[PDB]
């Protein structure tokens, strides 16, 4: 699954673990 | 003295500022949000769960007469039919067997096993904000929780703070809040006395032991044809496991700003939105004067690579004359860097190496020393990582 991240962050729930929070960079 | 500053309302990432007083020797502060609780006021109205349609046993008269009479149970349907000839076990339990005039009754009343499972509705008010703050003034650490007002102090034995108010209030609970087993929906619920039949909130109740239960969920009775005696009784089917099928995702899965919503009390943990406004009343005890920390002489800024990430991907070494050793502190007084370390160790004369973040593309920050300050130019590459798992702990700012 594609899934575009904004610069504030995501936080993705994938089954019964602990939340993960990713963030997104300036990588042009 | 009096201190105020504009902490970002972020959790879990320190943030660092040097205090200058006029005839003394500045001194590091770190303020980091170790907890935000967002607690709205609630207020119970009913609650509700799958009613369980207790049948009374009907009864008969042989050939007599009967009527309706008004009852205040919950949802009472009332009906009286003609002949019916009952039969159980011999077949003959009225004589007369004209006119065999049959009563029907059947209310609703709450399930055994709704002390558990149960959906209670709250509507919520205007939600204050408290906050908790671990501050370090020097050598000097403390921890303290205050409310987000503005008006209502925090002290922890020496300190006076005043934080508040949000200058963005925001709030991801709806006017209409439902709690069903820990999860938290914003759902729109039908007032009390004003049920929908075959939606949420069917059956209400003060509470799971009150005997006030109201409702209305559509018992019609049908006359027996049957000479066996039985009731039969038709209904529109409960809202209540309708609403558990067409439920949707709860606020733990779909709240704004990612925040973990707690129940009992309802509450918004750890939940980063706006900047909060904290005035800290340092105590005079804590500050030492110039003449005691070492100033420095003159002190230059030798830059090394630099990335613009969201991590400590910039190195810089300064190198000073100084006069004695010691202990002074290190800020980068931009906006748009900051730095790892807050204090280092001085020696006379010889260099030293800090670390640094920034999300600039361009180097253009002023490094503090013991109050003097020294520019800085560099051009950062941009970074090679593309999702990396740590916050950004800066903002760009406008056209820079
Ligand atoms: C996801 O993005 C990549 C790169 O554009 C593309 O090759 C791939 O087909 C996309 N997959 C989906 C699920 O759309």
């Not at chain 2, 009286?80 to 009754?105: H, I, K, R």
């Not at chain 2, 209409?176 to 009390?192: A, H, M, Q, S, W």
């Not at chain 2, 520019?375 to 702990?393: F, Q, Y």
Request: proline share 7%.
């Amino acid at each position: 699954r594609n899934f575009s991240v904004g610069r504030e962050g995501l936080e993705y729930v994938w089954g019964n673990h602990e939340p993960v929070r990713v963030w997104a960079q300036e990588s042009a | 003295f009096e201190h105020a500053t504009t902490v970002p309302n972020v959790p879990g990432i320190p943030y660092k500022a040097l205090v200058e007083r006029a005839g003394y020797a500045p001194l590091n502060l770190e303020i980091t949000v170790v907890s935000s609780e967002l607690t709205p006021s609630t207020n119970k109205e009913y609650v509700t769960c799958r009613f369980h349609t207790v049948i009374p046993s009907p009864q008969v008269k042989c050939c007599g007469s009967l009527e309706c009479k008004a009852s205040s149970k919950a949802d009472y349907t009332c009906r009286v039919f003609g002949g019916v000839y009952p039969f159980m076990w011999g077949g003959a339990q009225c004589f007369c067997d004209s006119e065999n005039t049959q009563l029907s009754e059947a209310y609703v009343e709450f399930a055994p096993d709704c002390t558990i499972d149960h959906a209670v509705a709250l509507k919520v008010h205007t939600a204050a904000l408290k906050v908790g703050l671990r501050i370090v003034y020097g050598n000097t650490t403390a921890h303290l929780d205050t409310f987000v007002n503005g008006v209502t102090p925090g002290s922890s034995r020496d300190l006076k703070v005043i934080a508040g108010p949000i200058s963005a209030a925001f709030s991801p609970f709806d006017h209409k809040v439902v709690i069903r087993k820990g999860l938290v929906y914003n759902y729109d619920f039908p007032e009390y006395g004003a049920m929908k039949p075959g939606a949420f909130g069917d059956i209400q109740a003060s509470s799971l032991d009150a005997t006030d239960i109201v409702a209305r969920t559509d018992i019609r009775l049908l006359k027996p044809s049957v000479k066996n005696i039985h009731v039969p009784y038709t209904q529109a089917v409960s809202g209540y496991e309708m609403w558990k099928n067409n439920s949707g995702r709860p606020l733990q899965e779909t709240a704004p700003f990612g925040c973990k919503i707690e129940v009992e009390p309802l509450r918004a943990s750890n939940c980063a939105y706006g900047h909060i406004p904290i005035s800290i009343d340092i105590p005079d005890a804590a500050f030492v004067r110039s003449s005691e920390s070492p100033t420095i002489l003159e002190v230059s800024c030798t830059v090394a690579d630099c990335i613009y990430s969201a991590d400590f991907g910039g190195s810089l070494t300064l190198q000073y004359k100084a006069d004695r050793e010691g202990h002074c502190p290190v800020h980068s007084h931009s906006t748009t860097a900051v730095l790892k370390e807050a204090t280092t160790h001085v020696t006379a004369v010889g260099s030293i190496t800090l670390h640094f973040s920034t999300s600039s593309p361009q180097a253009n920050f002023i490094v503090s020393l013991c109050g003097k300050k020294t520019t800085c130019n560099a051009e950062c590459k941009p970074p090679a990582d593309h999702i990396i798992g740590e916050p950004h702990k800066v903002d760009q700012e406008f056209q820079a």
